[PDB]
Structure formats: structure tokens, C-alpha cells
Design an enzyme around this catalytic site. Structure first.
Site, short mmCIF file in Angstrom:
data_model
loop_
_atom_site.label_atom_id
_atom_site.label_comp_id
_atom_site.label_asym_id
_atom_site.label_seq_id
_atom_site.Cartn_x
_atom_site.Cartn_y
_atom_site.Cartn_z
N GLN A 356 0.82 -1.21 0.00
CA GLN A 356 0.00 0.00 0.00
C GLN A 356 0.86 1.26 0.00
O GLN A 356 0.80 2.06 -0.94
CB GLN A 356 -0.94 -0.02 1.21
CG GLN A 356 -1.93 1.14 1.27
CD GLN A 356 -2.88 1.02 2.44
OE1 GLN A 356 -2.79 0.08 3.23
NE2 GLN A 356 -3.80 1.97 2.56
N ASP A 470 -10.67 -2.51 8.71
CA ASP A 470 -10.30 -3.02 7.40
C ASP A 470 -9.68 -4.41 7.53
O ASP A 470 -8.74 -4.76 6.81
CB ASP A 470 -9.35 -2.05 6.70
CG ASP A 470 -9.20 -2.35 5.22
OD1 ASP A 470 -9.78 -3.35 4.75
OD2 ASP A 470 -8.50 -1.57 4.53
#
Lengths: 600, 600
Positions: A356, A470
């Protein structure tokens, strides 16, 4: 009774990693232990080095008296806090008049005090100091460390490549400077400053180091606050040293008005304050007066410290051996703390994915307690934006304060660009593809244990209250066939798409995120893991997901699922998000379920 | 007092790695500890499992009595050898009549005895057994481990890829077989054998496992040698079990002529032999006779073991609780040994050079005491020739028997093709190019310490007498800026060229190799390291080397060499190879040299 102390005798270990273990009897005292410590290296000094105790995570210290029992101290203070919150420190506190002279005739002590107060400098003032002074001290320090090196030595592009790619100067120069100057500019600074002290030696550059510390810091003394007066009592900052005797300031740069000298001193004694205020009194006797000088400090601690101060100067510059504080032993050299992370101890391995923040790598770290630990190294493609930098920091500091086995554990950081991460390696990697490839091979008891360990983990989160929002199988990460550790812990804002099939209706609708959605996404996590990795609703939109949940439509059971297992999953399928049970319930339930599984 | 014991309750740890720690008081006994151990898992048995002590590096064991003190044992036997040479073992020794029945109604004990004696099988008889029987047991074992797996499960090329690339069957099938059959042949064997037991369960395949162990091994009993007779005394092999009561053989396959039964037994007592022979006597009483049966064993050890034998069958099949051997305690579950090395715990990393036997790689290992250790992995291009295989083994076993920090340490081996090595990584690698690149950067004190550590190392070689013959800087290998470990240790015979410039004249002429040439090549090693890596005699032939030595021509000193340093090097340059001094001399000298260096 054995003992560990960090010393400041030189070795090949790091400049702040000069440690030894001394084994001594109960009869052994701090004064007695120092005898062994110095006789390790033939120092010319008998009554000079003192001993300081210290808290690791605080600026509190305790200089300690000679005839005290080692174990008596270790009792009296470890009973207050763990040994991970105490630390002995062998150190100078004392200096004769022209100490530069009296220990320039003592080269081991020369380098001792040198490294010591140079360290203290790098602790407190290196990030503050002028550019120029920093370069001065640093190139004198090159001359120190490199005793037989040439004076034209650092004149090369090659050497510059060395000093940047191999050595690096967090040891030597400050963060403040080095993150303020171009690479080439910094090079030429170091050049011009290396030209001038090109050919000194140790002793020479050493005394120059002291000359350069003089204008910017009065290391001759320490500085304490107090208030004096028998009768009307008056705040001062009684900073005492051999350079003056006894004095005090009324301004910053004032020459402190003199009172008395160490040679004038006669006696010491201290006690607690007159009242319940957390302070202590300290009466003295000075040469030839009817007259007590009585300092009062903010603590009995500092009362004792100044008692030791004065008594040790008496030992220093007089032949006094006994304490002026009127209140076969033989040592042989053999959780939650501050972490120091450098760059040199690192492998720069191969690419291990595409993440990410950015690409990610693996590598190694080395340390005295445990070394050569190969790890994952979470990184970023670009470090230009300070917001991404702060979140890159935030995940680290987030995962810092935990203490648990099956939490994935950072070990620490290198906080210069490119800042990197030390994730103890998620070895077999992505649990998703892992179990996808290992479909026809694995055992449901191990799946139950996956769920169990994750249960205990996120249960501990709730016990110390962090929300992830998440959680995903791609965020679950693996160590082994018997260990999967919670991973990621990062913040990213704020559009589409989202792991809707994992998420709960409240979130999908209006960004509500609590223990309810936590239990739901843990539910989908358990589910998909127990699916042999089969995702929800193949070929379906994320749009109809919310419609079908609010229609009450739920995921089918797995083939060959256990009763109690899907029972708990359906307990987690309470459409009322409030009613979906707790993670402690998940713990106790899945515990007893695995108990009966092992029972078969 | 805490305690560690390996148990045989199932977990995710390895099938032979089922360990726990129990904390108990001095009052605690072996019988008492087993209560905790069984209550960990709700077993139906109170007086069945016994306790066995065992030496790690030997086949000697000691079954132990109930009311004995744990610490009394730990004393009485650890005072003989270290705890790395002792090992508790919780185990069955006892079985009721139709034990298959009496513990087929006890499923935890079912699997317990199953795994136990299946283990013992894999220890002793797996490499011996018939191909067919091995396949039988192995596919029944597939059915065991995989309790919810399909019967058409292993019908796939994919599954075969799984079982070969991921699982592997050193756990399950023998070395003897698996290194006797083609991959595809072995596949189809496993196929046809998997067809027939396709759909049993645990209990079923379990009792079949016992049925298949019956013809090939009588696990119902153990087999002891002895000689009986009060008066004329007669060697037998008294193998006793519940299947018979008391009997003995006169031939291999004989039905042993029966004597008595456990229910007939009354009493036990033992003592040492009649004489100084290292034996013990064991009198008994059997139901309704004037008549002592007296066995004599080769040891009082085995006398006590058979005392425990009989008393424990009495506990077993009678309600007896007290010992028939006429001679708040509460436990809570919390160097030099045998090493087991598997393949699954391994990283398969990148190429890290090109070596002698073959290419070399790095990777990881995992273990309970310490795990995830990244390492170097010494390998070979071809393993076709058994001679190279034997030398590949020989270096390993050579470096095995040492015990030292700065010896490079193997950890162990995987002895199937491709056989690999576990070298704890030589991290920064080749000291030659290392110091070549780090020419203008390093410190002579560290060079002195290089020499010091190598001195202590090869000194320890001489203290335990191995000769290397090929010591080289390219053979010196690195861990750090403060650690270089001795490496390679390999045998290769027998033409040109040779490291002539390193070697001594006696060797160069007629292959003489002793401590003399050892000191000389250590000399060239120290030299070239201290050269900042400059080789001898650049652009010169290896031919004139011997001529110039015998001319007395020697290597020049390094620039800026220390006096005592080159002095010792020239001590090592005694043309008389006999006269070149010893490695203990190198130790003491270089020790004091570094002492004075640190003194500066």
C-alpha cells in the site's frame, strides 16, 4: 550475586554498547566494584569514578555512595520498578583543577572522559549546536577514531562513497544538521573542515574537543536548583564545579559570586525537609567559621546526591577516604525499554511484493541480546509527503504499545529517509493464496486454531481498545502452519471500491464502525478462511450486497462445517449489529470447541 | 521446582514435539505428576501410564516408581550426567487383556498408544519392513491424519504435486523404501494402496494398524534376557506381556511355555547380586505355592524395571494401589544432544555465489527453542558420486564435534537428495573483497582482533588436533565488523595450481603438512589481511616462490605495521619449519599486543 553494568571502555561493540557482567558477593560495595572495573584496564585513579543509577524511560538518576551494599541497592530500588526500569552507569562525576592536565597524564581516563562527555554532548546539544562547531568536533573526531590515517585521506570521491554508503554519521553528526544540507554541500563542508586539523593525534584533538565544548557548555560543573537562607530563603541555581569552588549565578553569563572552596569544606549531613514537602535538608561545615551553609533541594534524592558530590570532591582533591556524611567479597568480570535502531546491521534483500505505502523487502538485523534476525521490511515508493510519512509512523507507534505473542511485532525504525520498518517476517505470506494452493491438504482443527488465535488477538485489541476497520484475509498474514499473526495496522483516507462483502451494513451505509462491524468482519474472515479460501458471492456486484443483507440473506454454510462452528458464526450474524456477541464470548466458545475437537 | 517432559498428546507442533512444562513441589511423585498430565485431557485411566527416564545419546532408559520424589530423581541422576544427557518420557508400559477393546472404549488413550507405538515402529522397524506392509500402514495413516478427507482425494496429479513439493513423507514412510523406488512408481503404489482403505475412520484404521503390527512385531510385550534357576541356572529371554501371563521361549516362533499369570502374583522384592557382578536379584511370590520364581537380570537397573513391570500389571488388572516391592504438593502445567532436521521449515532463497562442491544459497530454519534463523546453505551442483557425497558429509561431521563461539557452526543436515547444509550465515561474506572495498576506512585494532580471534580458533584446533592444509583469506569468512568465523573444512584430492604463495616449502616440495605449515599459512593469512588485502608477489609465477624462500627472501613489512606485530610474523618466518612457534604462543603474544594497543 552477579551484576551487569555498561562501562565506557572501548571495544568493537558500538560506542554506546560497552557492557560487561561483574560477579560480586553481598559484602561488595559500589567503590569496591569500581576497583575491578578499572583494574580491567590499568587506570591511574583510585577515588575518581563514581557510580550512577538510572531509569531507562526517564531522566531520573541516582548517584550512589561507596560502602553501600550492591544487593542492598538492587533490593531498595528494584522493589520499586523492574530491572527493565533501572540501570547502573559507571561514570565520572569528578574532575581535579586542571583536569585536562591531571588526566592528560592519564590516557585511558583521557579517552574515558572524552567519550563520556562527548556522548552526553551528542545526547543533549548535538542537534542544537552551530553548523560550524559541529563540523569542528566531527573532524576532530575523525582524527580521534582514525589514529593512523592520512591527512589527505578523505580527499576522494571514493572515500565519500564510503562514508555515505557504508559508514554514515548518525554516530557523529546531528539529525538537525544532516537533514539540513545537500549531499555535495555537506561533502565540501567536511572537506574544508578536514583540511585544517589534518594531522593531529588523539591527545591533541582531544584537548581541542574540550576547548570547543567550553564556549557552548560548562561541563566543568553540573547545574542544580535550590533556595538558600537559614532565615529568609532565596531561590538560586547552585551549579558547583572545581573551576570555581563554591559560587552561584545571578545571571546567565555572570561570573558566579564566590562563597567557598572544596578545600574549605569540613563535614556533610542531610535529612528530610522540615515538613511533609517532598524535600531534604543538607547542612555543611566550611573551613573556619561558626557558620552553616544549608542548601535545600527539591528532593532528599538530590540532597543525598549533593552529599555525594561534596564528599567525592573531598576524596578527589584531598586524601580523604572516609565519608563526611554524618548520618571474602570479590567481584570478577564475566520487557518495555528504549530501542536504538541503526542502518549498518541490515540486509538489503529482494522484492517480496507490492504493498500500500509502497514496495516491500526482507532483510536482517543484528543486536547483542539476539542477532541476525531475518525479517520483513515494510517500505514506501515515495516519502515526499509528510502526511504519508506520519501515517507510516502511526502504524508503527500504534503497534508499539502492544505486548502479546500473536500480535505481529515491530522491533523498531530508522527515522531518516528512506525510513524503513522491522516486521518480524510474515514468512509464508498471504494466507489467501496460501490456503488456495493448500486446498486439498489441510486440517479443520488447524482452521479452528486459526480462528482461535485471531480470536484471542482481536480480543486483546478490545481489552486495550483499538479499531482496525479493514480486517481482511489479505491483511491476515502467516508465520507457519501453527502461527498466523495480526498484521498491517495502517490508516488511509478517504473513495471506492471498499471490501463491501466483508463489511457490515451500518458501515456500508453511513460509515459506522464499532465492535459490531468488528465482529462482522471477523466473521467474514473466519468464514473465508474456513471456506478453503472461497470468496463471497463470485461474479456479484458490491451493490446488491447491502440489499441482500437487509433482505436477511446470509452466506450458506461451508461443506462439512461443524455445528458449533457455524452456530457461533450465526451468532455473529445478528442483523442487529448491537446484538452480535463479544470477542470474549468468541474466546470462551472457540476454546471449548477446540477442546471438544481434540477430544474428537 | 518446575519440570519439562515430552508428552504424546496431539498439538500442531511436530508429531514428536509434544512438550509441556509442569511446576510441582518436592512432595510431588511420578504417579502424582501423571494425574496432572492426564487431567489436561480427560483420560479414563488412573493407574495405567508409567514414566520412563532416558539418556539422549544412548539406548539406556529408566522406568520409575510412583512415590519417588521428582527432585530426588533429578538429583540422583543429574548428578551423574547433565540434563542434556537425561530425559523424562511419559509413556504406556501396560496393557489390559483385550487392550484394543479396553482402550477402544478410551479414544484419547486409543490415539495415545497408537501414536506412541507407531512412533516406536518408525524408530525401529520402518526401515526394515516389507514394502507392502509399509504402504498398508502408511495409507491407514493417511486415513488417520485426514479424518474428514475424501476417498477419491489423492486421485490427482495436483495432490501428488502437493505430497511431494509440500508434505513429504519422512514422517510416515521409511528412508529404506523411499530411496528405493521411482517417483511415479511410488505414486502408483500409494494410489493402489489408497484405493482399498478409502473410507475408514480413526478407530477402524487404528485397530487395523494394530492388526498389521501383530505379524511383524509383538508389541504386546517387551523382551528381556535373563537366566533362571535357583540351583542350576539357565539363560532364557523372559519376554512378559498380558497376552500370556508368564512364559518364556525356547525358539523364535515358539508359543512360549507358560509358567504363571499376573493374577497369580503376590509379592516383589529385589537387591543386588550375590557377588560383585553388576547384577541384581528379584524374588517373587506366585499364587499358591511354596515356591519362589527368581529371575536374574544383567543389572539391578533391570531388576528394578521388572519390579515396576510386575507391580504395574498388578495395579493394571487388579485394584492394587500399594507397591508389592518389599524393599501442599501440586504440579501445574506451564549443549551436546541429538539434532533432528526436516525440510519444511526452510526458505529457498537466491544464489549467493559459486563454490567448490557447487552453488550455494541462503535460507531459514524454524525450531521450538530458537526459530526463523536465516542462514547460508552450502550445496552441490551434482550429488551423483558417493565419494563427493561422503566428503560433503565429512566436512559436516568434522565441524560437528567442535564446541566454540568463533568456530563457524553447522546446525545440521537433511540427508536425502538434494542433501543440504545449515551454515549460520557468513553474512558480509568474502573477507578478501570485503577488505578490498573497505581499504581506506578500517582500523588496525580491528585487524589485530581479526588475528586474535583466528589465533584462538586455530589454537583450539590444535587443542583438539585437526589439520586444514588449505587455510586462505577466501576461506576466511565474515559475520560482522567484530566477528570473523573459521569456515569451509572440506577434503579434496588430489593437481594444479595450489595456493603456493600461501604454502610452506616442505609442502610445496613433498606434500609435508604439519603445525609448521599451519603456522606459515596462518602467517600469510594474517599478513594479507593486514595488507589491506594486498596479495603477495603481484604478477609473479608460483614457480620462483620456492626458490626465493629457500634464498631466504621474505615478504616486506606492511606500511605502518606495528613492531610487535611484524616481530611475531617474523617469529613465524623461521625458515626451519620446526622452529616456527606455537599457536598458544600466538595467543598469549597477540593478547598482550592488543592489551597494549587498547592502552595506546
Amino acid at each position: 550475586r552477579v551484576l551487569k553494568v555498561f562501562h565506557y571502555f572501548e571495544n568493537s561493540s558500538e560506542p554506546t554498547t560497552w557492557a560487561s557482567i561483574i560477579r560480586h558477593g553481598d559484602a561488595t560495595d559500589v567503590r569496591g566494584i569500581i576497583q575491578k572495573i578499572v583494574d580491567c584496564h590499568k587506570v591511574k585513579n583510585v577515588a575518581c569514578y563514581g557510580l550512577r543509577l538510572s531509569h531507562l524511560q526517564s531522566e531520573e538518576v541516582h548517584w550512589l555512595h561507596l560502602d553501600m551494599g550492591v544487593s542492598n541497592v538492587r533490593e531498595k530500588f528494584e522493589l520499586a520498578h523492574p530491572p527493565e526500569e533501572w540501570k547502573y552507569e559507571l561514570r565520572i562525576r569528578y574532575l581535579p583543577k586542571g583536569f585536562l592536565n591531571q588526566f592528560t597524564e592519564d590516557k585511558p581516563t583521557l579517552n574515558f572522559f572524552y567519550q563520556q562527555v562527548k556522548n552526553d554532548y551528542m545526547l543533549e546539544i548535538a542537534d542544537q549546536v552551530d553548523q560550524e562547531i559541529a563540523l569542528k568536533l566531527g573532524c576532530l573526531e575523525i582524527r580521534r577514531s582514525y589514529g593512523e590515517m592520512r591527512g589527505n585521506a578523505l580527499e576522494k570521491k571514493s572515500n565519500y562513497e564510503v562514508l555515505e554508503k557504508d559508514v554514515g554519521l548518525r554516530r557523529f553528526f546531528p539529525k538537525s544538521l544532516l537533514d539540513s544540507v545537500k549531499a555535495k554541500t555537506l561533502r565540501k563542508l567536511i572537506q574544508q573542515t578536514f583540511r585544517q586539523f589534518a594531522n593531529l593525534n588523539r591527545e591533541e584533538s582531544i584537548l581541542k574537543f574540550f576547548e570547543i565544548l567550553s564556549p557552548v557548555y560548562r561541563f566543568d560543573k553540573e547545574c542544580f536548583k535550590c533556595a538558600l537562607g537559614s532565615s529568609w530563603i532565596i531561590s538560586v541555581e547552585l551549579a558547583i564545579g572545581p573551576e570555581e569552588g563554591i559560587s552561584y549565578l545571578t545571571d546567565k553569563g555572570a561570573n558566579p559570586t564566590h562563597l567557598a572552596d572544596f578545600n574549605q569544606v569540613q563535614t556533610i549531613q542531610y535529612s528530610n525537609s522540615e515538613d511533609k514537602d517532598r524535600k531534604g535538608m543538607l547542612q555543611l561545615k566550611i573551613a573556619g567559621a561558626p557558620e552553616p551553609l544549608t542548601v535545600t533541594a527539591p528532593s532528599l534524592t538530590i540532597a543525598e546526591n549533593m552529599a555525594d558530590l561534596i564528599d567525592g570532591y573531598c576524596r578527589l582533591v584531598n586524601g580523604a577516604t572516609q565519608s563526611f556524611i554524618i548520618r571474602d567479597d570479590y567481584a570478577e568480570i564475566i520487557s518495555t525499554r528504549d530501542y536504538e535502531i541503526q542502518r549498518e546491521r541490515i540486509e538489503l534483500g529482494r522484492c517480496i511484493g507490492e504493498g500500500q505505502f509502497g514496495d516491500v523487502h526482507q532483510g536482517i538485523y543484528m543486536s547483542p541480546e539476539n542477532p541476525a534476525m531475518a525479517v520483513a521490511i515494510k517500505t514506501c515508493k515515495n516519502c515526499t509527503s509528510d502526511s504519508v510519512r506520519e501515517k507510516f509512523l502511526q502504524e508503527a507507534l500504534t503497534m508499539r504499545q502492544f505486548d502479546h505473542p500473536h500480535i505481529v511485532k515491530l522491533i523498531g525504525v530508522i527515522t531518516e529517509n528512506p525510513v524503513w520498518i522491522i516486521m518480524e517476517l510474515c514468512t509464508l505470506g498471504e494466507l489467501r493464496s496460501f490456503l488456495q494452493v493448500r486446498k486439498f491438504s489441510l486440517d479443520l482443527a488447524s482452521l479452528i486454531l486459526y480462528a482461535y488465535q485471531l480470536s484471542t488477538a482481536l480480543a486483546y485489541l478490545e481489552s486495550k481498545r483499538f479499531v482496525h476497520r479493514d480486517i481482511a484475509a489479505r491483511n491476515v498474514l502467516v508465520s507457519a502452519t501453527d502461527c498466523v499473526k495480526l498484521g498491517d495496522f495502517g490508516l488511509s483516507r478517504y473513495k471506492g471500491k471498499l471490501p463491501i462483502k466483508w463489511m457490515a451494513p451500518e458501515s456500508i451505509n453511513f460509515r459506522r464502525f464499532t465492535s459490531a462491524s468488528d465482529v462482522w468482519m471477523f466473521g467474514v474472515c473466519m468464514w473465508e478462511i474456513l471456506m478453503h479460501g472461497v470468496k463471497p458471492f463470485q461474479g456479484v456486484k458490491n451493490n446488491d450486497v447491502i440489499g441482500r443483507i437487509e433482505n436477511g440473506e446470509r452466506l450458506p454454510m461451508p461443506p462439512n462445517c461443524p455445528p458449533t462452528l457455524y452456530s457461533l458464526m450465526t451468532k455473529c450474524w445478528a442483523y442487529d449489529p448491537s446484538r452480535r456477541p463479544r470477542f470474549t464470548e468468541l474466546k470462551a466458545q472457540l476454546s471449548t470447541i477446540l477442546e471438544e475437537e481434540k477430544l474428537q
